[PDB]
Amino acid sequence: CKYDFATSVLFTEAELHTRMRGVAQRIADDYSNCNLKPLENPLVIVSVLKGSFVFTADMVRILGDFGVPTRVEFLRDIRGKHVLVLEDILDTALTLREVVDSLKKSEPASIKTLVAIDKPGGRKIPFTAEYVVADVPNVFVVGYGLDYDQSYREVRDVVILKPSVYETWGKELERRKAA
Amino acid sequence: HHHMEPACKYDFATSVLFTEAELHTRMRGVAQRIADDYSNCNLKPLENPLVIVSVLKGSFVFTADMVRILGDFGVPTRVEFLRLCDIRGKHVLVLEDILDTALTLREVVDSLKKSEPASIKTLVAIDKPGGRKIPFTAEYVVADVPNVFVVGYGLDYDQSYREVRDVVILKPSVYETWGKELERR
Ligand SMILES: Nc1nc(=O)c2ncn(CC(COCP(=O)(O)O)COCP(=O)(O)O)c2[nH]1
Ligand SMILES: Nc1nc(=O)c2ncn(CC(COCP(=O)(O)O)COCP(=O)(O)O)c2[nH]1
Ligand SMILES: [Mg+2]
Ligand SMILES: [Mg+2]
């Protein structure tokens, strides 16, 4: 494996970007009759969870390439506006269920969701994102904005950490606790 | 002789000042200096990362690109947004998309110093050195621009254009027209 701290790379940055371009084409098609324009009527991107800044930064630029202008708001007026909620990972769906339900109360013209990583096996309630870049199984991943204990968000790929990473850090946490 | 001037890429811009490629080239140069400068600190994921404090809403683009480049150069980070975890005894690098009057960074740095970080430095994507209202020098600057209003690379005009990949001069046409519309509202 490329990374000394990982056992597996699941998706490279290049694979993610290729899938993101395919999703951007669909979004450009789906919103083509919405008359989106900078200033007068951008697509409102609502980015949810701290780590989603990486995905949001790459995705709004790719959407711009495909002719979909955006404004961004972070959750870490939309009445009559088109809203696309972005999140780095969708797992239990408890976050997005709450965010979507709250945004609906402001009566946007439409609301859809776009997630970089779906763990469809992780649900605690039923929830389907309109747009999914990639799926993973029920494993804990880091990278592409996703962290372990606030570290590793900067890893360019989505990866599975080595067990020794959690073990060393637990032990150091114990150590610092006693001292 | 007759000079030929090609038209600008973007219908809303007068001039592209820095392309995404130029920005990333300069960010790699800066990342090498940062790696050299923090090589004496024994930084590590989890036990001792560099705390990146990202300031202002539009700085998410710069921050996303910069933490990944720093990772390539072996500088592990953790990111915090001001648009705060304990920083006492930690190295802090404050990131900001643009530095102009310096009033934001002066306040942010002074506040953070109260928590006694191990060190504090600043890294900015665009410095407008002629815009100062107080003296201020960033430790690390990706690019300088003259006193003109730019958008792109996370910088907005009234919340639009952050997604433009290049840093560009916004056409006066755009904000004169839109400004009167906002007045009308
Ligand atoms: N780093 C990381 N990797 C995972 O595989 C993973 N699976 C769940 N989570 C925690 C969180 C994701 O935390 C993401 P962040 O650090 O705040 O970007 C799941 O929240 C989505 P949901 O369960 O409400 O739908 C994960 N965090
Ligand atoms: N979009 C944009 N372009 C500029 O040229 C420019 N020059 C100043 N500003 C406004 C703000 C930058 O606003 C950045 P953002 O939309 O919140 O990412 C200057 O703040 C830095 P300082 O004056 O405290 O040092 C600008 N905003
Ligand atoms: Mg997390
Ligand atoms: Mg602004």
Nearest CA to ligand 1 atom 24: A95
- As a whole number of angstroms, the distance between CA B77 and CA B89 comes to 15
- What residues pack around ion ligand 3 (CB closer than 5 A)? A 147
DSSP 8-state secondary structure symbol assigned to residue B57:
G
> Residue A58: CA atoms inside 13 Å, Cβ hemisphere, count?
27
3-state secondary structure of B141: strand
Among B78, B74, B106, CA closest to B92: B78
- The residue of chain A nearest to residue B174, with distances taken between CA atoms, is A39
CA distances from B105 to A54, A118, B98, B176 (A): 23, 37, 10, 29
Give the nearest partner residue to A70 out of B54, B79, B163, using CB atoms.
B163
Q: Is the dihedral of CA B39, B52, B27, A1 positive or negative?
A: positive
Please give the class, per CATH, of domain B1-185: alpha beta
| Token representation of residue B7 | 């038209």
Tell how far the Cα of B60 is from the centroid of ligand 4, in angstroms: 12
Contact (Cβ atoms closer than 8 angstroms) between residue B142 and residue B26:
yes
Q: Which amino acid is at A171?
A: K
Token look-up 């989603």 returns: A52
- As a whole number of angstroms, the distance between CA A122 and CA A132 comes to 15
- As a whole number of angstroms, the distance between CA A137 and CA B94 comes to 36
Check if A91 is active-site. yes
- The residue of chain B nearest to residue A13, with distances taken between CA atoms, is B68
Contact of A42 with chain B, judged by CB distance below 8 Å, is answered with yes
DSSP 8-state secondary structure symbol assigned to residue A71:
E
Token look-up 């890294």 returns: B123
Which CATH code for domain A1-179? Answer: 3.40.50.2020
| Token representation of residue A153 | 């968000």
B40 exposed, middle or buried (CB, 10 Å; 0-12, 13-18, 19+)? exposed
R_g over Cα of chain A: 18
- As a whole number of angstroms, the distance between CA B159 and CA B154 comes to 10
| Token representation of residue B134 | 């107080």
Token look-up 């006492």 returns: B88
Pairing of strands A131-135, B119-127: unpaired
Instruction: Measure in Å the smallest separation between the Cα of A129 and chain B Cα atoms.
Output: 23
Q: What backbone phi and psi angles, to 5 degrees, belong to B180?
A: -65, -35
Among B172, B173, B166, B123, CA closest to B17: B166
Please work out, in degrees rounded to the nearest 5, the angle formed at the alpha carbon of residue A160 by the alpha carbons of A158 and A166: 130
> Residue A109: CA atoms inside 13 Å, Cβ hemisphere, count?
13
Token look-up 């020098």 returns: B137
Token look-up 């953790």 returns: B78
Token look-up 């990146």 returns: B52
DSSP element (H, E) containing A64: helix A53-65
Contact (Cβ atoms closer than 8 angstroms) between residue A13 and residue A158:
no
Judged by its nearest atom, the ligand closest to the C-alpha of residue B131 is 2
Q: How many other CB atoms are there within 10 angstroms of residue B75's CB atom?
A: 25
B14 lines ligand 2 (CB under 6 A): no
Contact (Cβ atoms closer than 8 angstroms) between residue B97 and residue B55:
no
Q: Which amino acid is at A169?
A: W
Tell how far the Cα of A119 is from the centroid of ligand 1, in angstroms: 10
B17 lines ligand 2 (CB under 6 A): no
CA distances from A79 to A44, A103, B74 (A): 11, 9, 45
- Domain ranges in chain B are 1-185
